[PDB]
Design a protein around this ligand. Structure first.
Ligand code: GDP
Ligand code: CS
Ligand code: CS
Ligand code: CS
Ligand code: CS
Ligand code: CS
Ligand code: CS
Ligand code: CS
Ligand code: MG
Lengths: 320, 35
């Protein structure tokens, strides 16, 4: 008989929860048609602008000057043009201002210090493709739509059949949900897919945080993991953003996030170390098992593959 | 439990890592102080 498989996505903002959801529609659903991709132009541009602005704002706080002082006019002009360009379209004027700002060594200098502030991980993706994106005959591709960033009004979800199972994937995130909603989200869970942004290991801590992003995520995992209520619940761990991690580990040591770390600075050892920090949180290595996968939420191929395995674990953890 | 707190603190407080979300709104346009 058909089983309802209630999947709950958990994890800090930016961990990739929303992105896994979209991957499900592309893989186990229809995906996005052209009539529907065209629909995202407005957001693709909205996001592109918000990104260059996030960086421009960062230059102020961090006091990083433009490689060329002319850019100050562009920056000031960025905010006017932006707040004046009908959504969905981008003029040859705005495209220029952005291209010049993104090209500035001062701005690139600030971009390289994104660890000191909060820059979404789509800024690079879009700012580089300005050539394509800016052209007026532009049609967002699937990967373009996958990288977008929209509204989490309430709770996001998707229904899809895979290996004859009725998958219901849930994802809250930002939407303050009370013990009400929460208890109601947990009740019925078949598997919790906990997302972690590996690349967050080098983030400078905020003025409010006692511990860093990683350890805050570690803390939450700990609870979800060792909570008797989720005993029979399959606990999949997605150590996401491995591409950014690999790119980063090169320049920024893991000792930033785990001062005691003494291994080498290879994607391999650093990654293995983080996999242990999370899995050692498990208080019943005998009782429960953690299903860890290093992934790249934005990679449809890898996600399809990884979700293929998660299902096997679900298909049989149901002791059958 | 505080569990509800932690989840609201980790999955929310970082969604800020994206005041960069949704369509463009007047708030995200306020010209930076270093004007
Ligand atoms: N480069 C890269 N970006 C990613 C990856 N996973 C998620 N992202 C991006 O990082 C952000 C996290 O977004 P999602 O939209 O997944 O929101 P979340 O559920 O709050 O963490 C988005 O900008 C994604 O496009 C990944 O593996 N690699
Ligand atoms: Cs299907
Ligand atoms: Cs499609
Ligand atoms: Cs200068
Ligand atoms: Cs960066
Ligand atoms: Cs490119
Ligand atoms: Cs839906
Ligand atoms: Cs559906
Ligand atoms: Mg979010």
């Amino acid at each position: 008989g058909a089983r309802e498989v209630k999947l709950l996505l958990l994890g800090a903002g930016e961990s990739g929860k929303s992105t896994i959801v979209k991957q499900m529609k592309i893989i186990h659903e229809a995906g996005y048609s052209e009539e529907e991709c065209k629909q995202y132009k407005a957001v693709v541009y909205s996001n592109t602008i918000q990104s260059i602005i996030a960086i421009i704002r960062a230059m102020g706080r961090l006091k990083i000057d433009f490689g060329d002082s002319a850019r100050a006019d562009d920056a000031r002009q960025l905010f006017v043009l932006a707040g004046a360009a009908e959504e969905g379209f981008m003029t040859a004027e705005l495209a220029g201002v952005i291209k010049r700002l993104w090209k500035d060594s001062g701005v690139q200098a600030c971009f390289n210090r994104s660890r000191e502030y909060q820059l979404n991980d789509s800024a690079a993706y879009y700012l580089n493709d300005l050539d394509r994106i800016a052209q007026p005959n532009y049609i967002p591709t699937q990967q373009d739509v996958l990288r977008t960033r929209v509204k989490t009004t309430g709770i996001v979800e998707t229904h899809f059949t895979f290996k004859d199972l009725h998958f219901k994937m849930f994802d809250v995130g930002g939407q303050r949900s009370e013990r009400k909603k929460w208890i109601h989200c947990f009740e019925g869970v078949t598997a919790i897919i906990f997302c972690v942004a590996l690349s967050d290991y080098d983030l400078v801590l905020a003025e409010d945080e006692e511990m860093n992003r990683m350890h805050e995520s570690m803390k939450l995992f700990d609870s979800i993991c060792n909570n008797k209520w989720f005993t029979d619940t399959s606990i999949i761990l997605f150590l996401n953003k491995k591409d950014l991690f690999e790119e980063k580990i090169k320049k920024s040591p893991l000792t930033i996030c785990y001062p005691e770390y003494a291994g080498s600075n290879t994607y391999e050892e650093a990654a293995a170390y983080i996999q242990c920090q999370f899995e050692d949180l498990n208080k019943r290595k005998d009782t429960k098992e953690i299903y860890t996968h290093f992934t790249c939420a934005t990679d449809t191929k890898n996600v399809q593959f990884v979700f293929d395995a998660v299902t096997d674990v679900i298909i049989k953890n149901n002791l059958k | 439990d505080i569990e509800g707190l932690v989840e609201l603190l980790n999955r929310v407080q970082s969604s800020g890592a994206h005041d960069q979300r949704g369509l463009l709104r007047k708030e995200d346009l306020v010209l930076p102080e270093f004007l």
